[PDB]
Structures are given as structure tokens and as C-alpha cells.
Symmetry: none
Subunit: 59 residues, 10 copies
């Protein structure tokens, strides 16, 4: 017998509740990111980014 | 016998509830990202990005 | 016997409820992304992006 | 015996409920994306993008 | 017998509740990131970043 | 103006998911009740009972 | 103006997920009740009972 | 203006997750009640009982 | 202006997670009650009881 | 202006997590009650009891 269970980058038992949650954003140049719940990813090469915000990259 | 279970980049047991949740965004140049729940991905090459916001890339 | 179960980039047990959830967006140049629930993807080459917002790329 | 189950980029058990959910968008140049629920894809080459918004690419 | 369970970059038993939680952001150039709950990822090469904010990278 | 909204005995926003849920019952005299999800009733006189089990009423 | 909202015996925002949940019952005289999720009722006279189990009422 | 909101016997924002939860009951005379989640009721006269178990009432 | 909000016997913001929770009951005469989560009721006359267990009432 | 908020017998912000919690009961006459989480009730007359266990009331 051989058994090799293996999980990587996983999110499984999640329960969320929200009520009467007002929210307001006002962007005037640049970036905004809000409310990123229960995500998972796996990337082998390249950059792996979750909810990343940059302002204007000017050159 | 051989058994090799393997999961990568997974989101499975998820339950969410929201009620009377007002929300308001006002973009005037740039970027906004909001409300990204329960996502998963797997990318082998290239950049893997989830809910990423940049302002104007000017050159 | 050999058995090799393998899942990658999966989202399966998901239940969501929302009620009386007002929402308002006002874009005046740039980009907005909102409400991206329960998605999954797998990309082998190239960039893999989920709910990504850039303002005007000007050159 | 050999059995090789394999799923990639899958979304299967999903149940969503929404009620009296008003929503309003006002684009005046640029892009808006809203409400992208329960999607899955697999792309082998090329970029794979789900709910991506750019403003005017001007050159 | 051999069994090699192995999990890396995992978030599984999570329950969150929020109520009457007002929030307000006002970006005027630069970047804002807010509300990043219960995420996990695994990246083998490249930089792995979760909820990272830079202002305008100017050159 | 008069407005009198009134609800009694109501169940409305409900989403359930179940998978690979084996179940087995073996009654040999008496009663069994199982799996009673999302029900509502209103009774003005008489007894109101939901998922009630008695063994043999012998006299 | 008059407005009299009134709810009694209500269950509305509910989301449940269950997976690989084996279950087994073995009654040999008497009663069993199992799995009674998200129910509501209103009874004005008479007894109101939800998921009540008695063994044999013998006389 | 008059407004009289009034709720009695209510259960509304509920999210539950369960996985690989084995369960086994063995009644041999008497009563068993198990798993009574998220219920609400309102009874004006008569006894109001939720998940009540008696053995054999013998006389 | 008059406003009289009033709630009685209410359970609203609830999130529960359980995993690999084995359970076993063995009744041989008498009563068992188990697992009564997130319930609410209101009774005006009569006895109000939640998850009450008596053995055999013999006379 | 008059405002008279009033809550009685309420349980609202609750989040519970349990994992690999084995449990075993063995009743051989009498009563057992176990696991009564997050309940609320209001009773005006009559006795109000939550998770009460008596053995055989014999006369």
C-alpha cells in the first residue's frame, strides 16, 4: 500500500455572514481593491498576486 | 495498491450570506475592484493575478 | 490497482444568499469590476487573470 | 486496474439566491463589469481572462 | 503501508460574522487595499504577494 | 397613508448543497423521520406538528 | 403615515453545505428524528411541536 | 409618522458547513432526536416544543 | 415621529463550521437529544421547551 | 421624537468552529442532552426550560 494525499493552495471550510454593511469608495486616480474573500490559487512560474493595487505607473 | 489524491488551487465548502448591504463606488480615472468571493485558479506559466487594479499605465 | 485522482483549479460546494443589497457604480473614465463569485480556471501558458482592472493605458 | 480521474477548471455544486437587489451603473467612458457568477474555463495557450476591464487603450 | 499526507498553503475552518460595519475610502492618487479575508495560495517561482499596495511607480 | 406588511410562518431565502451523502435507515417497528428541510406552515386551531415520530400507540 | 411591519415565526437568510456526510440509523422499537433544517411555523391554538419523538405510548 | 417594526421568533442570517461528519444512532426502545438546525416558531396557546424526546409513556 | 422597533426571541447572525465530527448514540430505553443549533421561538401561553428529554414517564 | 429600542432574549453575533470532535453517548435508562448552541427564547407564562433532563418520573 501507498497513499500520498497532497493539497496545496486550498480553502475549503468557510462560512461568512454580513448584514447591513454599508460601504463607499471614491477613487480619483489610482486604484482601489476591496472585499476579497475565500480565494486560492497556485502558480508555478510567473508572479502570483492576490488583491494588489498600484497607482499610475508613469514613465 | 497505489492511490495518489492531489488537489491544487481548490475552494469547496463555502456558504455566504449578506443582507441589506449598500455599496457605492465612484471612479473618476483609475480602477476599482470589489467583491471577489470564492474563486480559484491554477496557471502553469505566465503571471496569475486575482483582483488586481492598476491606475492608468501612461508612457 | 492504481488510482490517481487529481483536481486543479476547482470550486464545488458553494451556496450564497443575498437580499435587499443595493449597489451603485459611477465610472467616469477608467474601469470598475464588481461581484465575481465562485469562478475557477486553469491556464497553462499565458497570463491568467480574474477580475483585473486597469485605467486607460495611454502611450 | 487503472483509473485516473482528473478534473481541471471546474465549478459544480452551486446554489445562489438573490432578492430585491437593486443595482445601477453609469459609465461615461471606460468600462464596467458586474455580476460574474459560477464560471469556469481552461485555456492552453494565450491569455485566459475572466471579467477584466480596461479603460480606453489610446495610442 | 505508506501514507504521506501533506498540505501547504491551506485555510480551511473559517467562520466570520460582521454587522453594521460602515466603511469609507477616499483615494486621490496611489492605492488602497481593504478587506482580504481567508485566502491561500502557493507559487513555486516568481514573487507571491497578497494584498500589496504601491503608490505610483514613476520613472 | 397606511401600510401594514405582516408575514407569519415564512421561510424564504434558502440555498442548500449536499454531495456524496450516503444515508441508511433500518426500521423494525416504530417510526423514522429524516431530512425535513425548509418548510413552513400556519395552523389556527388544532395541533401543528412538523416531523414528529411516535412508536406504536398501543391500547 | 402609518406603517406596521410585523413578522413572526420566520426563517429567511439560510445557506447550508454538507459533503460526504455518512449517516446511519437503526430503530428497533420507538422513534427517531434526524436532520430538520430551516423550518418555521405559527400555530394559534393547539400544541406546536417541531421534531418531537416519543417511544410507544402504551396503555 | 409612525413605524412599528416588530419581529418575534425569527432566525435569519445563518450559514452552516459540515463535511465528512459520520453519525450513527441505535434506538432499541425510546426516542432519539438529532440535528435540528435553524428553526423558529411562534405559538400563542398550547405548549411549544422543539426537539423534545420522551421514552415510552406507559400507564 | 414615533418608531418602536422590538424583537423578541431572535437569532440572526450565525455561522458554524464542523468537519470530520464522528458521533454515536446508543439508546436502550429512555431518550436522547443531540445537536440543536440556532433555534428561536416565542410562546405566549403553555410551556415552551427546547431540546428537553425525559425517560419513560410510567404510572 | 421618541425611539424605544428593546430586545429581550436575543443571541446575535455568534461564530463557532469545531473539528475532529468525536463524541459518544450510551443511555441505558434516563435521559441525555448534549450540544445546545446559540438558542434564545421568550415565554410569558408557563415554565421556560432549555436543555433540561430528568430521569424516569415514576409514580
Amino acid at each position: 500500500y501507498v497513499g500520498s494525499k497532497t493539497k496545496e493552495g486550498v480553502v475549503h471550510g468557510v462560512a461568512t455572514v454580513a448584514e447591513k454593511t454599508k460601504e463607499q469608495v471614491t477613487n480619483v486616480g489610482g486604484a482601489v481593491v476591496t472585499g476579497v474573500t475565500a480565494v486560492a490559487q497556485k502558480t508555478v512560474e510567473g508572479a502570483g498576486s492576490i488583491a494588489a493595487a498600484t497607482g499610475f505607473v508613469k514613465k
